[PDB]
Design a protein around this ligand. Sequence first.
Ligand code: 90F
Length: 300
Amino acid sequence: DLPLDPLWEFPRDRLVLGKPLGEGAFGQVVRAEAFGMDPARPDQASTVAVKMLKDNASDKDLADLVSEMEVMKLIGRHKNIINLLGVCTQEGPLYVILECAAKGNLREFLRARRPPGPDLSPDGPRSSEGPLSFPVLVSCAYQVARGMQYLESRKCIHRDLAARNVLVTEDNVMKIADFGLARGVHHIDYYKKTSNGRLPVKWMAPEALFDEVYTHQSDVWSFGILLWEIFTLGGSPYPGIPVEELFSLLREGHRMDRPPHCPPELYGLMRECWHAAPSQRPTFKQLVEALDKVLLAVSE
Ligand SMILES: CCC(=O)Nc1cc(N2CCC(N3CCOCC3)CC2)cc(F)c1Nc1n[nH]c2ccc(O[C@H](C)c3c(Cl)cncc3Cl)cc12
């Protein structure tokens, strides 16, 4: 139906669909096995993620997915983003084949790895030692920053940067996902709560929420929120604050408190990302450099 792009096109018969992963405003994602994604070894099996329309797809849903597909083509490959592996556009439903990150999104990754609390009977030399350590958390923050720095250089604005939009591979590499998505910024239900209880409005920069203005600096604001998520080990921002109260507090210039067990360096970066003037927030390049110094200092 769509034009053939031999650069990206992949034989759909070389895909074996398996367990569904998730569902969005447009399109669903299904885990699938792929054979010969590397043309050099045609019979080699690899696990991929296939994005496709729902059973409810309108012509707008198709247009959004087609748009997402083209964005993925242009943006190129980077270690810290979900990369395009191929597409299926000929003689069958539209598939957008993405990279796999085995461990799911960063929020659930962190929440599932919170330290055992005080109610655990000590067993072994590492009773009080959890899966997560400070340098790894900084690494997570650093990688997202460098990934966003790449997206920015490709003139790509995410518009909903958050821990649930960052995917974690088998080797704990951060990969930013859903960055080229048409999110319908002119009709956002600011009170809409997701199925898992998320209020996406708590990630919006003031200029984006109030003036519908999106820049790379508005992403920097969101990265500040994402930083807060990381060092709360998957906490929800503005704890116990309903959207109505969020509106007024933001107009009053209210900001989140410094989370427990979070060094002043990183809460400093958070507050810098949350400066009212977008020009007074650090660039992603500066964020990468600032987080690098912290990471190198804690990596003997
Ligand atoms: C390709 C290997 C794989 O299966 N990875 C995987 C499993 C999952 N899940 C979803 C939760 C599900 N568990 C099952 C047990 O009960 C709790 C949920 C299974 C594992 C979530 C992911 F984000 C991923 N990671 C993704 N890798 N590549 C993706 C491409 C699109 C994608 O989108 C889905 C809708 C998604 C999901 Cl499901 C969660 N957060 C963000 C996104 Cl963008 C996720 C991945």
